[PDB]
Each structure stands twice: as C-alpha cells, then as structure tokens.
C-alpha cells in the first residue's frame, strides 16, 4: 500500500552522463555507444542568443573545439553533426555502460523521470509529466541543460526529453532526442511564452482509481454522466477534453475497481464543484494529474 | 527555478541489490563487500511469524538453504548470523560494485531516498521522511521487503533504512542496517499500530523558504514572534516543538531570503490559524514537511554526486 510519485532507478542513465564544454560554456551530454548528444546552443556566444545561425556557427568549429569529459577522462571527438536542435558528437570510445535504449517522442500527459545533472554529474532524480502546453514543471538550475528525461520499461531505457531552457514563468522546455522541440518553442532568447496550461484529465481519473484501489471511496457518488456533459463541465475548470481514447485507456482500472469510467467522471465533476471539504485523497488536498493510467497499474495492482 | 521532491541518484545502490530466497520466501538483499543483508524474517513460514524464535529457526538452516542471486549469477553463501533484526549472509565473493558506504541511524524528521525493489530488481526510487512516529509513508507491495533507504554525502552512501513490514494504516516500518527498528515495532505477525503522528515544523519552515526562493511570497507578513509563543501554537496544531537548534540550522535561509525564522514562524502561525484562503504554495494546498533545511539548500544550489 501507499502511493508515491516514483521515479525510475537512475543508474542506467547515470552511466551515460558526460560534460560538454565549448568555449566558456559547459553543459551536460548523453553518451550512448560512440555518440554524445547535447543541446546545440552550447556553441552560442553571448551575442548569438537572439538569432543564432547554428549552421554558420557550427561550420566554424573543429572536432577539437569540443571538450567532452566522462568522469575524470577526456574523450576524443572525431566528428560532429547537427540534427534539428541537438548536436551529435562522435567520440573515439563507445560507452561501456551503454544500456539497452531507444529514443521515443512522447505526447502531452505522459510522465517520465528526470535525472538533473550539473557538469556531467547527476544531482537528483524526480518525476515529471509533459503538460498539455508542451512544457514541463521541473527543477533546473543554471548548468542543467542537457539533463535528460526517460522511462525504463523492462531494462530498456526510453529517452524522451533533453532539457534546453527555462521560460519566464519558471517552467521548462526541451526536445526529444532527435532534437525536435516539444511545443512551439525555439532555441533562441527571443520572447516566448507558454500557453495557458490545463489539467490532464485522464491522469486525474487514473489517480482517483488509485485512491479506490488503496481503499478510499469517500468521493464517489450515485451519479453518472455522458462523455459530452462531462467535457462541457470540466473545460470550465481548465481541464483537458477527455476523449474516447482516454475512456478506453481507463478500461482496465474500471474493471479492477468495479467503477465505470463515466461514473468516475461524475465523481470528478462533483469534486470540482465541491472541493475536498477538508479531506484528502492519497495524501493530497488537490487533484493530482501527473500519474498516468500506466503509472497507476504499475505502482498499484 | 522549480522545486520538486527529489531523490538521490540511485545507481550506486542498484549495483548492491540481490535476490534472497529461503524456502518459499523471496525478498531483497543488500550486497556489500562479502556480506548480504536482509530482514531476518526471511526464515519464517507464516506459522513461524505468529510467534518466532529466530535463533531456533536459524539453527536448522544450512548455508545452502539461502539462495542468493545477483542478476543472473548465483552467489555462494558460506556463513550466516543475525544482528538484531537483520540476517547477515557471508558469501564467497566481494561485491565488485561496492560503493564507499557507511551504516547510519537517522533521526525523525530526516529525509532519505528509498530504492523500491522486487526479486532483487530495483523498480522505483522515491524520497521519504522518517516520521515523528517512526513510520515512513512509503509505497511498497508484497516482495519489497529488504528494499533500502539511503543518503549520499560525497561519494559515500549512508545506508539508513531496510524495509520490514506494513502497518494496518498502510504506512511502513523497518530497521537501520544494524537491524534496530525505528519505532516501537517488532518483526512478528501481531497487533501493531502507528502512533499519532505530528508535523515536522522545521521542515515546513524550510519548505516555506524554498517557496520564497522560487517567488511564492503571498504568505509573508509584517509580524514576528517568539519561540515560546510559537511553540504554544505548534503544540495546539500537533506540530513538533521548534528548538533553538532548528532556528540555528535555518540561519542560512534566513540570511539569504531576509526572513528571520521567527518572522517565518509568524507566517506559519497565521497559516495554521487561518488556512491558505484558496491559495497554494509551491503547487500544494497542504503544508509540506518532508524537505529538510539541507534538502532545500541543496536543491536550490545544485550539489552533485558523480
Ligand atoms: C545562459 C543561458 O541562459 C543558456 C544558454 N542558452 N542559449 C540559448 Br540560444 C538558450 Br534558449 N539558452
Ligand atoms: Cl506518449
Ligand atoms: Na512575518
């Protein structure tokens, strides 16, 4: 029993973190096989921030302009290329600690673990979710660029996020490991702003199912709802639309608990209307939206 | 910017987790140098657990009754003995992945990372506090016994917790790595209950400082207070007493933010007496008490553990 925001064990990623230095700029790189991946803005100078021409900046660099340090050891860079917003440095050593891995681009609502790193050394691990507005609510200080987000399903590490920047509201933006940004953001210091964020409805419902599995029923009610009436209500609270995909995804949790998905939607509608009236659900006084249906089944059962 | 509940990187501990089987019971062990540590209740049938005589039960086991697997390699157990509530299995090979480590016993209010494991395989990591009532609010399913809690200082892993049991309220009880229980619990299937818990005041204050550092300031006010006045309020709200050592420990955060501790206590007093009035602090509608002052400084300073 219990229910915690749980990260994946970080060891397989720890063995891949390196330091990348270019000029006066140092950030983190991810070393897999004989390639080190890092944000391409490592090659920017203080004059390049607003409108960098990365192709022009990169053609001026030699392999030996990139200093890559793995623990106490310099790696030799023997080649470089840019893919979208990530730099791929070929090095003359395959990482002996390379796990089974893949690169996966995730959708809003998906969760993943973040290994926060500074100067190529891991600092901490925490759990995040891709918000509907394509930002993440992380904990990142200067020097954290190049820290990565990942899942570990069955000893295979799926890398899904690399950290590039902090937006003025204090939330964070980055790319997949093919260097494509999540959301409308760009690696320039021109004014950009996240969209208004919304609550991840399918995740709140999953977490309510978690509460029932762990023995709490106080928030249920005798009512049901149509899917369309639910969405009409929930969007007035800045909740994401719930789709038939989401209803299908919640099938397993509905079968385990005996509570139909649209009945749980009626409970959520009432909670939005009433608040919690001094009670808690799984130890929270707010509705939690950073647990996916998959997360709940893996942690509970 | 940002503030998250954050665990230490778990890699150094993952390389120490093994699977320990005795009879029909499989659980987790911690493999350090040439010894595997695990809960002594691994040797009990469900009959035994009602009223175990552990010395008696262990007499009948040979080394070969202890099946230990490190990944896909079996380890050869060559000796066995108990220390308090932990079983120590001497094996024929030192763990080549043994980190620099120490066994430490933590105080209530202190935090640590838990590496939750099943069948010797790490499955998740999360951050816990030792509660005033000596339980932890963990997340554990059957098979998680022997999972461990730890902190990292430099390159040194300080092991402080080994999981033994779940209490009826769904919270968790365990030992230090020398087998001494945290709290008034015994490793036996008998009636046991968590005592009434209290809130860790110094940690709430730490978290309010974290909030201010992150720009969440609506709860600040013009007032200050005294230790004696505040502690009367804390007692009334089932908060732990604030001592002078607590105030000293928060000294750095007081100097950095410009909010004296008793200045911040006046904020906390008003929050206790009046609630949050529909507002949140660092995204929470509850007052969070599982970040220590050290946690807040570290996360707001980027300390690392390569
Ligand atoms: C010093 C910083 O703020 C980080 C460097 N950086 N360059 C770009 Br272009 C971006 Br986005 N971030
Ligand atoms: Cl996805
Ligand atoms: Na004040």
- H or E segment and range at residue B32: strand B25-32
CA–CA distances in Å: residue B126 to residues A211, B12, B90 = 19, 15, 29
Contact A283, B288 (CB under 8 A): no
Question: Do A159 and A130 lie in a common domain?
Answer: yes
Are residues A45 and A81 both part of a single domain?
yes
- Residue ending a domain, among B99, B128, B157, is B99
Please tell me the distance from the alpha carbon of residue A58 to that of residue B257, in angstroms, as a whole number: 42
**Resolution of this entry, Å:** 1.7
Chain B nearest-CA distance from A178, in A, is 25
Which CATH number do you get for residue A151? 2.40.10.10
Structural domains in chain A (count): 3
Q: Which residues of B are known to be catalytic?
A: 41, 145
**Do residues B186 and B204 share a domain?**
no
Q: Find the domain containing A192 and state its range.
A: 1-14+100-197
User: In terms of domains, do B205 and B57 share one?
Assistant: no
Q: Do residues B172 and B129 share a domain? A: yes
* Nearest-5° Cα angle at B242, B240 to B248: 140
- Residues A301 and A269 grouped into a single domain: yes
Q: Is residue B27 part of a domain?
A: yes
- Whole-angstrom Cα distance, residue B157 to residue B134? 22
Residue A293 is encoded by which pair of tokens? 């249906």
* Domain end among B176, B197, B218: B197
B229: left (phi over 0), alpha (psi -120 to 50) or beta: alpha
Task: Tell me whether residue B306 is in a domain.
Answer: no
Instruction: DSSP for chain A, please give it.
Output: ------BPP-HHHHTTEEEEEETTEEEEEEEETTEEEEEGGGG--TTSSSS--HHHHHHT--GGGEEEEETTEEEPEEEEEEETTEEEEEESS--TTPPSEEE-PPPTT-EEEEEEEETTEEEEEEEEE--TTS-B-----TT-TT-EEEEEETTEEEEEEEEEEE-TTS-EEEE-TTSPBSTT--SS-S---PPPP-B-HHHHHHHHHHHHHTT--TT--S----HHHHHHHHGGGTBPPPPHHHHHHTHHHHHHHT--HHHHHHHHHHHHHH--TT--BTTBSS---S--HHHHHHH--
C-alpha span between A220 and A260 (Å, rounded): 11
H helix intervals, chain B: 11-14, 46-50, 54-59, 201-213, 227-236, 244-249, 251-257, 261-274, 293-299
Distance from CA of B123 to the nearest CA of A (A): 6
Q: Do A122 and B9 touch (CB under 8 A)?
A: yes
Among the bound ligands, the one closest to the CA of A130: 2
Same domain, A117 and A193: yes
Query: In the structure encoding, which two tokens stand for residue A209, read together?
Result: 């199912």
Catalytic pick from A85, A145, A265, A300? A145
Secondary structure letter of residue B195 according to DSSP: P
* Residue nearest ligand 1's atom 11 by CA: A187
Within 8 A of A142 by CB-CB distance, chain B residues are: 302
Dist. CA B220 → ligand 3 center (Å): 5
Place of tokens 């021409």: A53
Query: Distance of CA B200 to CAs A28, A93, B245, Å?
Result: 36, 49, 14
**Distance set, CA B169 to CA A215, B28, B109, B140, B298 (Å):** 11, 23, 20, 13, 32
Instruction: Judge if B214 and B134 occupy the same domain.
Output: no
Q: Give me the CATH number covering residue B281.
A: 1.10.1840.10
Q: Which residues have a Cβ under 8 Å from the Cβ of A80 and sit 6 or more positions away?
A: A58, A61, A63, A66, A87, A88, A89, A90
Do B188 and B53 contact (CB within 8 A), yes or no?
no
Same domain, A7 and A136: yes
Give residues with Cβ within 8 angstroms of B235, minimum separation 6: B241
Does B284 sit within 8 Å of A285, measured CB to CB? yes
Task: Judge whether A139 is closer than 8 Å to chain B, CB to CB.
Answer: yes
Greatest alpha-carbon span in chain A: 69
The Cα angle at residue A182 between residues A179 and A187, in degrees rounded to 5: 60
Asked whether residue A35 falls in the same domain as residue A149, the answer is no
**Max CA distance (Å), chain B:** 69
Q: Is residue B116 domain-shared with residue B206, that is, in the same domain?
A: no
Q: Cβ separation of A15 and B11 shorter than 8 Å?
A: yes
The DSSP letter of residue B41 is G
- Whether B167 and B257 share a structural domain: no
């Amino acid at each position: 029993s219990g229910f915690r925001k749980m990260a994946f064990p970080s060891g397989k990623v720890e063995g891949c973190m390196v330091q990348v230095t270019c000029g006066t700029t140092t950030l983190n790189g991810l070393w897999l096989d004989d390639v080190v991946y890092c944000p391409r803005h490592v090659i920017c100078t203080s004059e390049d921030m607003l409108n960098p021409n990365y192709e022009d900046l990169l053609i001026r660099k030699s392999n030996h302009n990139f200093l890559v340090q793995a623990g106490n050891v310099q790696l030799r860079v023997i080649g470089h290329s840019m893919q979208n917003c990530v730099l791929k440095l070929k090095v003359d050593t395959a990482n002996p600690k390379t796990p089974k891995y893949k690169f996966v681009r995730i959708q809003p609502g998906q969760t993943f673990s973040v290994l926060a790193c500074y100067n190529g050394s891991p600092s901490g691990v925490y759990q995040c979710a891709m918000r509907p507005n394509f930002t993440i609510k992380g904990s990142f200080l200067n020097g954290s660029c190049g820290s990565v987000g990942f899942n570990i399903d069955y000893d295979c590490v799926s890398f899904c996020y690399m950290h590039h920047m902090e937006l003025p509201t204090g939330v964070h933006a980055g790319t997949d490991l093919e260097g494509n940004f999540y959301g409308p953001f760009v690696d320039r210091q021109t004014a950009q702003a996240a969209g208004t964020d919304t609550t991840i409805t399918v995740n709140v419902l999953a977490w309510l199912y978690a509460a029932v599995i762990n023995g709490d029923r106080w928030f249920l009610n005798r009512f049901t709802t149509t899917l369309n009436d639910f969405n009409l209500v929930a969007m007035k609270y800045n909740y994401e639309p719930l789709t038939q995909d989401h209803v299908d995804i919640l099938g397993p949790l509905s079968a385990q608990t005996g509570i139909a998905v649209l009945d749980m939607c009626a409970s959520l509608k009432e909670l939005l209307q009433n608040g919690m009236n001094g009670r808690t659900i799984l130890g929270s006084a707010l509705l939690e939206d950073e647990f996916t249906p998959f997360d709940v089944v893996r942690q509970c059962s």
